[PDB]
Structures are given as C-alpha cells and as structure tokens.
Amino acid sequence: SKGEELFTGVVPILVELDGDVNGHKFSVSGEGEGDATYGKLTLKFICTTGKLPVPWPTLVTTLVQCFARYPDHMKQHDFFKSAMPEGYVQERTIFFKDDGNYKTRAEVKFEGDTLVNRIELKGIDFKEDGNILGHKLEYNYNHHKVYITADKQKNGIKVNFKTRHNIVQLADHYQQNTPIGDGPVLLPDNHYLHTHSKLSKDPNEKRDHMVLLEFVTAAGIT
Numbered sequence: 073s074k075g076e077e078l079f080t081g082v083v084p085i086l087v088e089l090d091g092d093v094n095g096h097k098f099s100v101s102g103e104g105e106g107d108a109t110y111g112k113l114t115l116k117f118i119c120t121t122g123k124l125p126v127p128w129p130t131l132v133t134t135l136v137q138c139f140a141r142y143p144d145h146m147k148q149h150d151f152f153k154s155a156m157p158e159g160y161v162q163e164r165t166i167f168f169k170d171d172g173n174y175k176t177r178a179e180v181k182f183e184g185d186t187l188v189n190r191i192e193l194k195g196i197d198f199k200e201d202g203n204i205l206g207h208k209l210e211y212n213y214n215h216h217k218v219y220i221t222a223d224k225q226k227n228g229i230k231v232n233f234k235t236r237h238n239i240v241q242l243a244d245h246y247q248q249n250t251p252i253g254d255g256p257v258l259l260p261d262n263h264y265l266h267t268h269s270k271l272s273k274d275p276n277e278k279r280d281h282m283v284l285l286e287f288v289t290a291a292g293i294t
C-alpha cells in the first residue's frame with residue numbers, strides 16, 4: 073500500500089493520554105520513535121499531572137501497531153499502515169479479572185512526519201484493595217500474541233488478546249480499529265502480532281515515568 077512507504081525509515085512518535093480511573097484524573101505524554109523495518113518501538117512516558125494513580129504496566133497496551141514488522145509474504149495483511157496517513161480510530165475495552173475495566177478511544181494518524189497517538193481512557197468499578205488501585209504490579213518483561221481478524225462491514229479489524237502481570241492479574245482485551253479516511257484499506261486474513269515488551273526507568277528522570285522498548289512482529293500465516 074501507499075501507507076507502507078511512510079514507515080520505511082525511523083519515524084518520530086508522540087503519544088498522549090487523558091485518563092480518569094474511579095474519578096482519579098491524570099495525563100500521560102510520551103515520545104520516541106518507531107522503526108517498522110525492525111518492528112521496534114522506543115518510547116519514554118511521563119505522568120504530567122504528578123503521580124500516576126494506576127500502575128504503569130496497566131497502561132502499556134493503551135499507550136501504535138502501525139509499527140509492526142510484517143514479513144514480505146504477509147504485507148497484504150497490514151491494515152494499520154494501509155490506513156495512513158489519514159489514520160485510524162482504535163477503541164478498546166479491557167476487563168480486569170475480579171476488578172474494574174478500562175474503556176479507551178484513540179486516534180492514530182500522521183501530523184506531518186510525526187505519528188501521533190491521542191488517547192482518552194475511562195476506568196470504572198475498580199476495587200480500592202484490588203491490584204490496580206493498590207499498585208501491586210511487577211515491572212519487567214512480557215510477551216503476548218495479539219489476534220487480528222477483518223471486520224469488513226466497518227472496513228476495519230477486530231482484535232483480541234489476554235495479558236497477565238505478576239503481583240497474578242489477568243485482563244481480557246477487546247479492540248476495534250476503523251479507518252478515519254474513506255480511501256481503500258487492506259482487510260487482512262486472520263493472523264497475529266508477537267508483542268514483546270520491556271519496561272524500565274531513566275535513572276536521571278525525577279518525574280513519575282516509564283521507559284518502554286517493544287518489538288512487534290506479524291505471524292500466523294504460512
């Protein structure tokens with residue numbers, strides 16, 4: 073697709089999130105770069121409103137799958153790049169086992185050379201002594217397969233996966249992505265993305281933050 077040509081090199085990224093979980097409002101901003109040729113994302117996130125009222129790892133999935141590396145034989149299945157530069161809307165619900173849920177809406181699109189992911193998140197029904205509001209999560213390495221199928225009536229895709237974070241907390245993620253523009257997109261055969269991520273800290277950063285390194289690779293079609 074033509075969208076694909078936009079990702080041939082290193083692309084700067086801006087990520088922005090306004091959130092409200094059980095009435096606790098906050099905001100996060102992040103920046104870095106993506107290199108789809110390697111499926112590689114490197115980002116640093118800051119909580120601009122002070123202390124994050126939820127654990128950083130619970131926000132990773134919310135905080136740009138257009139940077140996935142699609143092998144050559146699968147490139148006709150890359151919906152995400154095909155929707156660019158006009159972009160796509162990503163809507164998710166995340167159901168935390170025995171606890172609350174997040175509902176999110178994001179617009180992912182190019183603003184000139186910058187890929188911008190602008191998000192709103194609302195979280196409800198969380199328990200005060202649950203794992204999310206009680207901040208009980210580890211902060212290490214994860215790998216999850218992200219399953220994708222076409223949603224042809226909406227000219228987009230439907231996505232599902234599970235996460236697990238050690239305290240273990242389970243979450244079911246359900247996602248729908250729809251193009252912003254009216255032009256043609258690639259509607260994929262069923263496949264999945266390997267999503268491998270590592271969180272860390274910047275030793276010189278005083279603000280509440282997260283450094284993220286992520287490698288995303290499409291698979292599941294022989």
Ligand SMILES: [Cl-]
Nearest residue numbers: 215216217266
């Ligand atoms: Cl994986």
Ligand SMILES: [Zn+2]
Nearest residue numbers: 126127128207
């Ligand atoms: Zn925490």
Ligand SMILES: [Zn+2]
Nearest residue numbers: 090191192193
């Ligand atoms: Zn809004």
Ligand SMILES: [Zn+2]
Nearest residue numbers: 213214215216
């Ligand atoms: Zn493992």
Ligand SMILES: [Zn+2]
Nearest residue numbers: 235236237243
């Ligand atoms: Zn989790």
Ligand SMILES: [Zn+2]
Nearest residue numbers: 215216266267
């Ligand atoms: Zn994997």
